[PDB]
Design a protein around this motif. Structure first.
Motif, PDB file in Angstrom:
ATOM      1  N   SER A  55      -1.616   4.579  -6.205  1.00 16.07           N
ATOM      2  CA  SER A  55      -0.185   4.739  -6.399  1.00 16.07           C
ATOM      3  C   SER A  55       0.476   5.073  -5.070  1.00 16.07           C
ATOM      4  O   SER A  55      -0.102   5.759  -4.221  1.00 16.07           O
ATOM      5  N   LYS A  56       1.703   4.592  -4.904  1.00 18.18           N
ATOM      6  CA  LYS A  56       2.428   4.746  -3.647  1.00 18.18           C
ATOM      7  C   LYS A  56       3.248   6.027  -3.741  1.00 18.18           C
ATOM      8  O   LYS A  56       4.334   6.047  -4.328  1.00 18.18           O
ATOM      9  N   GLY A  57       2.717   7.105  -3.167  1.00 12.08           N
ATOM     10  CA  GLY A  57       3.404   8.378  -3.185  1.00 12.08           C
ATOM     11  C   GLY A  57       2.537   9.573  -2.846  1.00 12.08           C
ATOM     12  O   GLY A  57       1.399   9.694  -3.315  1.00 12.08           O
ATOM     13  N   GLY A  58       3.055  10.439  -1.982  1.00 18.55           N
ATOM     14  CA  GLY A  58       2.375  11.665  -1.621  1.00 18.55           C
ATOM     15  C   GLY A  58       1.352  11.511  -0.515  1.00 18.55           C
ATOM     16  O   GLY A  58       1.712  11.396   0.664  1.00 18.55           O
ATOM     17  N   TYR A  67      -0.670   8.965  -0.300  1.00 19.37           N
ATOM     18  CA  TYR A  67      -0.756   7.528  -0.061  1.00 19.37           C
ATOM     19  C   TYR A  67       0.630   7.018   0.328  1.00 19.37           C
ATOM     20  O   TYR A  67       1.487   6.828  -0.540  1.00 19.37           O
ATOM     21  N   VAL A  68       0.865   6.805   1.619  1.00 20.15           N
ATOM     22  CA  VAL A  68       2.144   6.290   2.102  1.00 20.15           C
ATOM     23  C   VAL A  68       1.948   4.852   2.560  1.00 20.15           C
ATOM     24  O   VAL A  68       0.955   4.533   3.224  1.00 20.15           O
ATOM     25  N   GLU A  69       2.904   3.989   2.214  1.00 22.38           N
ATOM     26  CA  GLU A  69       2.834   2.564   2.510  1.00 22.38           C
ATOM     27  C   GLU A  69       3.956   2.187   3.468  1.00 22.38           C
ATOM     28  O   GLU A  69       5.128   2.463   3.196  1.00 22.38           O
TER      29      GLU A  69
END
Ligand SMILES: [Cl-]
Lengths: 156, 106, 112, 154, 156, 150, 107, 156, 108, 153, 106
Positions: free
Chosen positions: G50-53, G55-57
């Motif tokens: 998941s994209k958030g926290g 895990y930055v994209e």
């Protein structure tokens, strides 16, 4: 299988009408006693002279009809030349013939008539000249039997 | 077959004349674009025979037939002669050939 | 004999499509550098036909043959069309041409 | 002379019979077509306009006796695209003509195995299709339309 | 950083086998050089025709096995049709192939045999006809490379 | 209302040792001008066609020497009136090993041909095979033959 | 090609931060519809990251590249991470993947 | 679809006259068997030597007329050289020929005469020297069929 | 296309010599003001080739055609080469270009 | 150069390799800048007092309409020696998208041309300048689609 | 417009006569190069009326008018008749037209 057994030269042509042509005069060379060799090409029912010189030009046509639909029918036969020097169709040999003598079969039934016309003469021709043997009425041609209608030239 | 070369084997003497005739059976090939090729016995070069002088070409568009008479025959004219034509109807464009061998004895 | 333009005399009807085929006989000329020129009957200027849209060009380098199919024929498209190619071997560079004529006859528009 | 016009990019090329050990595609033969913009570059077909095409090809393999057990004949139609400049297989087939055997005491056993491929695809401008085989030494382009390859804009 | 202005067409589909489907033939459409557009839907490994008309049906499968331990194995491949007018499975295209004609790898092994099968034909289909490409032995599938197994229809 | 000439004919199963094409069968077509004359399809209009045919060969053993299974689609045209092959394929079903006084091993070998060609009015197409004694018309759609004007 | 994962094998220690780069080679795939999937070492339960926290994209449309920064690496953040993208040209729409392994050693 | 298959060097030139030049001698190299490579420039119908050295200079011209009523006809063919050191055009190779010795071809028809002239020699040229092949009567040039007129140099 | 660069795609080996030819189709451009440009694959700089040594130029003012033979080829000479000319008739002044690519493969 | 001719004239066309900017060029086939006309920083400088004919065309192209509020403008302006303020000689406005913000993924490129022309009295040293507000919609791809020129009548 | 054809719609019987007058309104057109064109009812082809025989042309240059009287009207001579004149002033030279229809019963 066989082989050729004679050498000969001088452009020559003796083409005869196609019997399986119905109402048109298509010239053929791939038949028994007909010639087209030594450079003469036949394009659009026209002979193209391959080299300059003196030729003997001849043609005969046989006209046949089974009755005259009018008393004013005219049969013609002409050999023409369009030259590279003067690109206009000019008549070299020509003849006219009137087939029906005051009849138009009126008081009696139809009657088969036969009338031939022959042309021949010597002329000087140049390379690329297109000679054409022509008739005005191609529906009276009797190319059924043998060599009744033909057309040819030979380089003297 | 498409194009029919008739004299398939000719054997002439030096100083004479062989005539090779070809007849078209495919009505899309034209009597206008005719070609001749010879390949001399023992060489890997098919040469294109040119029309003029010693090489005479006779054409009749009515019968879709052309011929090639070769005069003044020497012993260097021993090979395989083929005829060719350019055919075209619709989206199709092709060419056609034959076959026939010549041997000249002195 | 160095480029062979095959359809020498063509006569098509207004609104049709003619193809002209040219075959390279010189094995040094390239099917990548092909050129087309038409000359309208009666005028003296060879214009160069551009490759695109109405003028479609089909090339095969394997047999070294290229063609030019022309669609939407009008009566103003009557003229002598030639093909061309650029040849290059060692220190030699040359070009080659052909020949072939087109005449387009009109439709006559039937009046009731 | 010509007749009815007809259109669409079309191609049906036939192998050169006079090419010994290689696969050269030709169009200047009786029942072969190459028209309306399709170009054959370096034994490759170049799509002239974007759209849906039908791709097909047949290869006929023949050998005079079976030498190796591990003989594999392959035939693939490949595409290198303008968007992704890597050659990828669209259609492929593999065939093993010899199940062991390897004739020791025999008199040569000629085998014939054909392979046919076909499919419909969306192609882009400038894409190059190529029909290739791994062993062009077993090609049998003898009698007729035994080896061919073509596309047609559907 | 590019531009696109491309058009569309008529019902079409070209689906490719699933490579990560263990010993099974699952048809996929969301993979490079695959199509499923203009109404053709893939339900239960079956293509649903979106409109009545003339169609071209084709499919290929590649069979691979790592030895011939049975001279009595049969490989078949069929495209069948269950239609709205007649709700019975009928074969449109079928082929049979015997992959192992020899007397089994009794000594050494590692003799992979590859046998492909191709099907093609034109048919009249109606709306809602469900086409299915199937094989009898889904354990011999060679979906390791790309474009080895496929199945498609195209509205002509 | 679908136009364009089309044909998809399938073999007659109750035909004694022969390849007879049928059109009045469940999933078969012959319409929009293509006629089936003397076991031949007659093209009704000039244009581009897609020609295809498949044949399935079955035998109950490998007899003497090698059998060659051939499958060819021919065209005899009005322009050139000789039967010429458009598509052809050959296949040898028997990898030697003729049954050495043991029991049989039924082999199956199918052959498929397909391609695009330019046909003219009056051209006669025929799909044919050399050994009509190995035809397997037991099931449906194992041997068939058809064209469609694309 | 079809998307290229740059850091193929990385080995970092617990408490650090790894960046994974994927580059688009197909001009039909977009850097807008990017997705990430993780597979923990020795288990075939590939999940969607998941994209958030942690895990930055990061996306850069110019170079057609997207990356995935993973912070606070643990000993359970060891596996195989793959990237994905949605491509669409004419009548075709598909997706593409990559491949590259991560191993984290704990201190 | 082709390129060179051996390097080959030194200044070289073999140009042939323009056939579609009704009454002038225009030198061309973009023809089947003509050369102009390795630095040689063709300026204003003049060859410009690119490097100092020894060159071989040659040229042939063919004259044709369809009758000659003027006894006073003199045909000349000269290769000229203007050097950077001495800026005056000087003759390197020259020839004269009298074609007409008659009694004015009178009464009868024409009679074409042909007279060719060839020149060749080796010279030391310097960088920038301009060589020019010229004739005095360019209305008798016969460049019709073959490479009958040409002019070329080669750096030996 | 005013000016036609003829060898569009070339592939020669290290130690060879490629000839690139251009023919003028605009009768206003002059063979006296001819220009040559090379652009190495991967570089964004179009460089100007100087006339001398490895770069030999052949011009014909009659045919309005010029060529550029390049000798001693290395593998760092792989790029897109263009030719140029300056045209002028009345109040007009412009220049013209072409197009054509070179790739050279190494050896051992 | 075998033709005299005179009268100050200029017909400049945009540089295609400019991306997002309108740079006027003269060194291209069928373009003129002669007989005294000077082109400074994308501006034409009149060399002599007299009657001139001023004209310009711009072609705008877009791939999608993100906002109803799209305004396309094209003006030929003049800063004169007598009155040192830029004044518009010819101007035109065009709104390419009447709302209809394209929905879905349909790529339908819109094209809008704008043309201006007139006769004016200019003095020596006057600077005419043709400019557009959104040089991000210029379509200088094909050819003579965008240009700007004067001719001394 | 220029050239006012006055009899717009006329209806005569077979065996009568019609005169159609056209008056020039452009002072650059001349009554000297006058032409008449009819389109026979049913086909959309303009034929050129001849200025001799039945179709008689009367010109009065003072009033800048020309006419076309038809003597013996038949039944198929029913159609739209237009008049024309050739104008020339400075660098311009052009032609002008009108309109007027005839219907003939028996
Ligand atoms: Cl496109």
């Amino acid at each position: 299988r066989s082989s050729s057994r004679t050498p000969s030269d001088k452009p020559v042509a003796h083409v005869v009408a196609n019997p399986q042509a119905e109402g048109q005069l298509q010239w053929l060379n791939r038949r028994a006693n007909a010639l087209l060799a030594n450079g003469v090409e036949l394009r659009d029912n026209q002979l193209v002279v391959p080299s300059e010189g003196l030729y003997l030009i001849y043609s005969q046509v046989l006209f046949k009809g089974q009755g005259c639909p009018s008393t004013h029918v005219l049969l013609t036969h002409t050999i023409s030349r369009i030259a590279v020097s003067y690109q206009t169709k000019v008549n070299l040999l020509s003849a006219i013939k009137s087939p029906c003598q005051r009849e138009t079969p009126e008081g009696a039934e139809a009657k088969p008539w036969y009338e031939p016309i022959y042309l021949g003469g010597v002329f000087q021709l140049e390379k690329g000249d297109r000679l054409s043997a022509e008739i005005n009425r191609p529906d009276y041609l009797d190319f059924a039997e043998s060599g009744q209608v033909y057309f040819g030239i030979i380089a003297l | 077959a498409r194009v029919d070369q008739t004299p398939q084997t000719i054997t002439k003497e030096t100083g004479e004349s062989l005539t090779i005739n070809c007849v078209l059976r495919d009505s899309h090939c034209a009597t206008s674009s005719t070609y001749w090729y010879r390949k001399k016995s023992g060489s890997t070069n098919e040469e294109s025979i040119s029309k003029g002088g010693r090489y005479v070409e006779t054409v009749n568009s009515g019968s879709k037939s052309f011929s090639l008479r070769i005069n003044d025959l020497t012993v260097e004219d021993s090979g395989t002669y083929r005829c060719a034509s350019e055919c075209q109807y619709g989206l199709a464009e092709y060419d056609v050939y034959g076959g026939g061998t010549v041997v000249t004895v002195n």
